[PDB]
Amino acid sequence: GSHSLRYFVTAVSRPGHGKPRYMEVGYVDDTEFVRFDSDAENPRYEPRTPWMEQVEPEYWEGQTQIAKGNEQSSRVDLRTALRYYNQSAGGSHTIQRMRGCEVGSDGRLLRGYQQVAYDGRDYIALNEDLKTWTAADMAALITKHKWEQAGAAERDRAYLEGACVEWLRRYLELGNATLLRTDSPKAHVTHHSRPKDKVTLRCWALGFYPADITLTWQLNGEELTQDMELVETRPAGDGTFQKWASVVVPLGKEQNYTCHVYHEGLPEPLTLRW
């Protein structure tokens, strides 16, 4: 199995409403584990998971310092962007970044990345070779040449291949019990009458972790392609997830349809029928 350490970072300007807001969020796989919020009463990096409470005080001292230096420099990036785009003054704009490493079960770095977006649109991104940049437009081309000239890709690569991979390992040790658990989905089917002698069958999966799952409906051994409604997988709020899938079927024929649930926490897929 693969794992990832990723940081997602947002600076949002608010001219005439004080300085930009700044947020950093760290995730191990997809679980949030640290957060820095410039708007908190006393802004500092904080643990977002009980297994993070165990780290040494120096952890928070260095990470809060990094976050504050990123906060200050992202204010500069917002002004720089306005300049590069020659945009009129007085609006809110956003700069976002994602940086992180994806590592296979053999410890190999599968993907290291650093991406930036301006106003929610791709701005610049480190290519998979960890040496060259893809710039989305002419503004980003200025950034690209500046970064080339400054050796920026080498510093990114050094971080992605080194500290990123090493700390991901550390975080997996610290949070193993929670991060790597599985909660199998509790599945059930509901039946709802629809005018015209039709019936909606909804197949629910609840209480599962991790979030990946597949739900299908079959009639006579084939999966119902279209005709099926499927909601985006959504957080229950307690660390687990939900999803459902429905199909509309002829009154009196419910029993020929079966729902199938595939999840890594099940020894084999579930099969349910009304």
């Binding site: 940081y7 952890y59 990470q63 990123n70 990036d77 962007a81 970044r97 610049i124 950034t143 971080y159």
Partner: peptide
């Protein structure tokens, strides 16, 4: 851990 981000 996070690191510094180079200015654009």
């Amino acid at each position: 851990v996070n690191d510094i981000f180079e200015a654009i």
